[PDB]
Amino acid sequence: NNQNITNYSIEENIINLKYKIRKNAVKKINTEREIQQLSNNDPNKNTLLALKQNLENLIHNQKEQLKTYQKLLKTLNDENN
Amino acid sequence: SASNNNQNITNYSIEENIINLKYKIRKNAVKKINTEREIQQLSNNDPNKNTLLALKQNLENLIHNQKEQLKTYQKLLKTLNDENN
Amino acid sequence: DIASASNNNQNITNYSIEENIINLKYKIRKNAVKKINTEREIQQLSNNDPNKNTLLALKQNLENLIHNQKEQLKTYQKLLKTLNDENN
Amino acid sequence: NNQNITNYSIEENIINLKYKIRKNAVKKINTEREIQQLSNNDPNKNTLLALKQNLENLIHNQKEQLKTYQKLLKTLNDENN
């Protein structure tokens, strides 16, 4: 009479986030890289920096998705664990 | 001679990224719907209510930043499929 | 033991899983469109071009992705009928 | 000209794939360990089996999309340009 894997579907959603976070971080750094190699370019330099910014927010929103799943998994395995 | 393509591969890489955001947006609208419903099948007390509430708010930002991501990727290729630099 | 079936009240079994299947449904539909694109640029392409090979090297794997995603959906779905929604 | 934006877009598909493969790898390993749960051949061990093995198919599939993209980006240093 024990829940089987139990804290499993929330374990792997946490993993999915860590690796989505570090991914778009790498993507972010590579957009800024690209932006820098462009100098007084055309209407691509400003489109990229928007895309860069969009990535920063996507990273913030995923970090708080993570913190919840993270902080929540410390909750349900509170007392009696 | 000239072979005026080169951009061949980047119309491609932008279209597929556009497709991706369009289906992510619609996918997350469902997740938001689902979330609002389990909220409603929950107590006014239960802590997991507050968790769900937040994951819904985070889902409201996500959809919004993916609308913005979409518009962008559009713009980049969108009109400026017009030989810029 | 045998009190009424309030499993439908407050549980993250209906949840967590539910979300994963919604994820798969829409990845399946996304990749179908993506493959349709690849079918299309393979139609408008050359038959001797360098891109026909890469494009004709991307559809392929989207076909297998679509198949492996359809199977993932049956599984997670089977894991749905099995627990709550006990086949009715 | 204008090939900076193109090396960018391929690179962004490439970075997205490295991390999808890496993420899908972590999920297999963690599904390799947990699938030897605790002998007690329970029901949901059947489900973890299928899940894990569709991870292998995902990984091998991403690994192919990414070599191509990598091979494609490679079409730039030397040969072309």
Q: How many whole angstroms separate alpha carbon B65 and alpha carbon D7? A: 25
For residue D36, give how far its alpha carbon lies from the nearest alpha carbon of chain C (Å): 19
Tell if the CB–CB gap between D44 and C72 is shorter than 8 Å.
no
C-chain residues within 8 Å CB-CB of B40?
Answer: none
Tell if the CB–CB gap between D61 and C58 is shorter than 8 Å.
no
A64: helix, strand or coil:
helix
For residue B84, give how far its alpha carbon lies from the nearest alpha carbon of chain C (Å): 23
Q: How many whole angstroms separate alpha carbon B28 and alpha carbon B23? A: 8
Question: Tokens in use for D6?
Answer: 């193109």
- Resolution (angstroms) equals 2.4
Tell if the CB–CB gap between B23 and C33 is shorter than 8 Å.
yes
D-chain residues within 8 Å CB-CB of B85?
Answer: 1-2
For residue C77, give how far its alpha carbon lies from the nearest alpha carbon of chain A (Å): 14
Contacts of residue B5, defined as CB under 8 A and 6 or more positions apart, other chains included, come to none
Burial D24-62 (b: 16+ CB within 10 A, else e): bbebbebbeebbeeeeeeeebbebbebbbbbbebbbebb
CB contact at 8 A, B25 and B66: yes
The residue assigned the tokens 């999808």 is D20
Q: CA torsion angle for A58, A61, A65, A68 (degrees, to 10)? A: 150
Residue of A nearest to C12 (CA): A9
Question: Tokens in use for C47?
Answer: 């038959």
Question: What long-range pairs does A46-52 form, CB within 8 A, spacing at least 24?
Answer: A47/B72, A47/B75, A47/B76, A47/B80, A48/B76, A48/D8, A50/B68, A50/B72, A50/B75, A51/B69, A51/B72, A51/B73, A51/B76, A52/A28
Q: How many whole angstroms separate alpha carbon C29 and alpha carbon D31? A: 27
For residue D31, give how far its alpha carbon lies from the nearest alpha carbon of chain C (Å): 15
C-chain residues within 8 Å CB-CB of A9?
Answer: 12, 16-17, 20
Spell out the domain ranges in chain A.
1-81
For residue D38, give how far its alpha carbon lies from the nearest alpha carbon of chain A (Å): 10
Question: Tokens in use for C39?
Answer: 């079918």
Tell if the CB–CB gap between D61 and C64 is shorter than 8 Å.
yes
Interface probe with B: pick from A20, A54, A74, A75, most Cβ of B within 10 Å = A54
CB contact at 8 A, C16 and A13: yes
CB contact at 8 A, C74 and C25: no
A-chain residues within 8 Å CB-CB of D48?
Answer: 5
Which residue, among D15, D13, D12, D21, has the nearest Cα to D57 in the 3D structure? Answer: D21
Tell if the CB–CB gap between D5 and A34 is shorter than 8 Å.
yes
Technique employed here was X-ray
Tell if the CB–CB gap between C18 and B27 is shorter than 8 Å.
no
Q: How many whole angstroms separate alpha carbon C14 and alpha carbon C33? A: 29
Tell if the CB–CB gap between B9 and D10 is shorter than 8 Å.
yes
Q: How many whole angstroms separate alpha carbon D16 and alpha carbon D26? A: 16
